[PDB]
């Protein structure tokens, strides 16, 4: 059950560094290689280096030597990737990587979830979150459709659920928008006609940066 | 480093068919009888995926569909056949040279029947209107193909500054499209509108899609 667990997203200043983790279990952890990985928004992925914790050995890519900088812990079985002289091209989603054996072709099984790295000037701003009930003018009909608009936000990400995660099916979050330094972004939900108002919705939206879990409940106009 | 080119860089296919990528390398990736040359898928939202290693071997739960080959300098990632969760992004990888490299990664998509969208508008919530901001929402979901121009009218006019639009990876269900276009105003030029209307063209529809609301 090999599990790599990496640390949340950061928002850091122009020039700063910014220090990510990927704690791993399930194997014997100084004995394989750890890689990270780099992937800008909406850009392919990139290689940056890697690290044997058994004796601390690493590798880096070239385009990478000088500004990361990879440690391992083995009492923690974390390992550490520092990024320095942070610019504004360092911005991207970050991923940790075990490496197999020789006769796997090195190749890199076991993943972290990644950790989003921002670096800006610019400061936290919670989502404004709003649900949007439908109009008078549908009559209902053989679905409905609701929505929930999370607006002016700043860093990214945020996670959207509808009723707590239990209602997925029908559901459509769509990529978060830039605009004047902030973020937006939407969700519907379709449902049955007979659903709703009879059944409560309610969206929830997480901003880990501005640490809010907001709920806003559907409810008619009127 | 050792160069991984990938082609084509976006490629679409009907279901059951045939999908073929191939990536060639600047330099032997080979090395005793072994092709240290991977393949990655990556879906939306998630971190890539081991898919094939070794050029020729499957992943850990890996369907026999996906099937690597080639050496040297040569390979090519063949699926077969193509199923509607397997709408991706593919990567080549090696693992020869002292630093390790990616290619530029392959879009897969799938072709499907034509599908009309399913419109819906909102008018600015409760909540937003007393805090002084207005905006209305507009949502085009479940649509192909993706080709699809979507325009705001206000009182017959024509609206495009303060219009956000965004759009959704291929479902990996149906292998629809949908988007969603939010047009945000100041609370006193809400109020001084009638009619606000979501209108799209689309295939589907020899006439404009059309979904309003009027004030008053």
């Known amino acids: 059950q090999v599990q790599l667990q990496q640390s949340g997203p950061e928002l850091v200043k122009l020039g700063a560094s910014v220090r990510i983790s990927c704690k791993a279990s399930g194997y014997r952890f100084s004995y394989s290689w750890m890689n990270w990985v780099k992937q800008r928004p909406g850009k392919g992925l990139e290689w940056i280096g890697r690290?044997?914790?058994?004796?601390?050995?690493?590798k880096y890519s070239g385009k990478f030597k000088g500004k990361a900088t990879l440690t391992a812990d083995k009492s923690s079985s974390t390992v550490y990737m520092q990024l320095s002289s942070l610019t504004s091209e360092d911005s991207a989603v970050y991923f940790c990587?075990?490496?197999?054996?020789?006769?796997?072709?090195?190749?890199?099984?076991?993943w972290g979830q990644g950790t989003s790295v921002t670096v800006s000037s610019a400061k936290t701003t919670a989502p404004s979150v709003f649900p949007l009930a439908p109009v008078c003018g549908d009559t209902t009909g053989s679905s409905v459709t609701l929505g929930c608009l999370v607006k002016g936000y700043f860093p990214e990400p945020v996670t959207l659920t509808w009723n707590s995660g239990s209602l997925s099916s029908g559901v459509h979050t769509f990529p978060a928008v830039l605009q004047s330094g902030l973020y937006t972004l939407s969700s519907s939900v379709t449902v049955t006609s007979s659903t709703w108002p009879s059944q409560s919705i309610t969206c929830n939206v997480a901003h880990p940066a501005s640490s809010t879990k907001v709920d806003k409940k559907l409810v008619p106009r009127g | 480093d050792i160069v991984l080119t990938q082609s084509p860089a976006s490629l679409a296919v009907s279901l059951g068919q045939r999908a073929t990528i191939s990536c060639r390398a600047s330099e032997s990736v080979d090395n005793y009888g072994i092709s240290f040359l991977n393949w990655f898928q990556q879906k939306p939202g998630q971190p890539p995926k081991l898919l094939i290693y070794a050029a020729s071997n499957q992943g850990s739960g890996v369907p026999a569909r996906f099937s690597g080959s080639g050496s040297g300098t040569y390979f090519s990632l063949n699926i077969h056949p193509m199923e509607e969760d397997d709408t991706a992004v593919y990567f080549c990888?090696?693992?020869?040279?002292?630093?390790?490299?990616f290619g530029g990664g392959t879009k897969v998509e799938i072709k499907r029947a034509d599908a009309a969208p399913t419109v819906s508008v909102f008018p600015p919530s409760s909540e937003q209107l007393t805090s002084g901001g207005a905006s209305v929402v507009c949502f085009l979901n479940n649509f192909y193909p993706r080709d699809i121009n979507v325009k705001w009218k206000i009182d017959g006019s024509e609206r495009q500054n303060g219009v956000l639009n965004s759009w959704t990876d291929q479902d990996s269900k149906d292998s629809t499209y949908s988007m969603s276009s939010t047009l945000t105003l100041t609370k006193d030029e809400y109020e001084r509108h009638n009619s606000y209307t979501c209108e799209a063209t689309h295939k589907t529809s020899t006439s404009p899609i059309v979904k309003s609301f009027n004030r008053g």
């Open positions: 990587a075990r490496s197999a054996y020789g006769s796997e072709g090195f190749a890199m099984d076991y």
């Open positions: 690290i044997y914790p058994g004796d601390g050995d690493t």
């Open positions: 990888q090696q693992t020869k040279g002292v630093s390790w490299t």
